Amino acid sequence: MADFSLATASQRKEWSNKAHMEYVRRSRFAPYIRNTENSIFQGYSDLEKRAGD
Amino acid sequence: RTEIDVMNAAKQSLTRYFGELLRDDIIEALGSVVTTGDTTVNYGSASAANRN
């Protein structure tokens, strides 16, 4: 063209602020981890109290 | 893994080390070697000519 002809290295760009993450697929063992006695994977909060190894 | 306070046991044993460090310097000062005019060399790091 021969109108106002802007340069190739003078053309603007733009960078976005919103970023994407990668999917993780949380857990398939999550409904089965409880602290009661009739659970498959049983937890113990006895060392969350006073002390121990 | 423990219940005993290691912090307070390390602060009491640290004030008590700078008391042993003071009389370890007075014993080293009494056994000094006065060479010539305020030149005190310790007995371990003195030569045979500084002792003569």
Side-chain angles (χ1 to χ4, degrees):
Chain A
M1 294 179 71
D3 291 333
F4 179 74
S5 178
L6 195 144
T8 62
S10 178
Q11 293 177 357
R12 188 175 169 83
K13 296 188 186 295
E14 183 69 28
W15 289 264
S16 180
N17 201 4
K18 266 64 187 299
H20 300 293
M21 296 294 173
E22 172 173 351
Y23 181 70
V24 165
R25 189 174 60 244
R26 178 258 182 90
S27 181
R28 291 287 189 267
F29 298 110
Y32 293 145
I33 299 169
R34 296 280 86 84
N35 284 317
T36 61
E37 291 86 4
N38 55 3
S39 65
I40 300 172
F41 307 108
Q42 187 177 3
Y44 288 98
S45 66
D46 292 332
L47 298 178
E48 187 176 0
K49 293 185 285 186
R50 296 181 66 181
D53 194 6
Chain B
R1 297 177 179 177
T2 62
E3 192 179 2
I4 53 177
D5 47 352
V6 187
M7 177 179 176
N8 199 4
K11 291 172 71 175
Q12 291 179 356
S13 68
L14 195 62
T15 69
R16 202 169 66 238
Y17 175 68
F18 282 91
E20 291 181 352
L21 193 64
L22 181 60
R23 94 285 191 275
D24 201 4
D25 290 332
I26 298 172
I27 296 169
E28 191 70 30
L30 290 173
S32 297
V33 170
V34 178
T35 302
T36 47
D38 309 334
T39 304
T40 60
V41 181
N42 290 320
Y43 185 78
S45 65
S47 66
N50 291 319
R51 294 174 183 174
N52 295 321

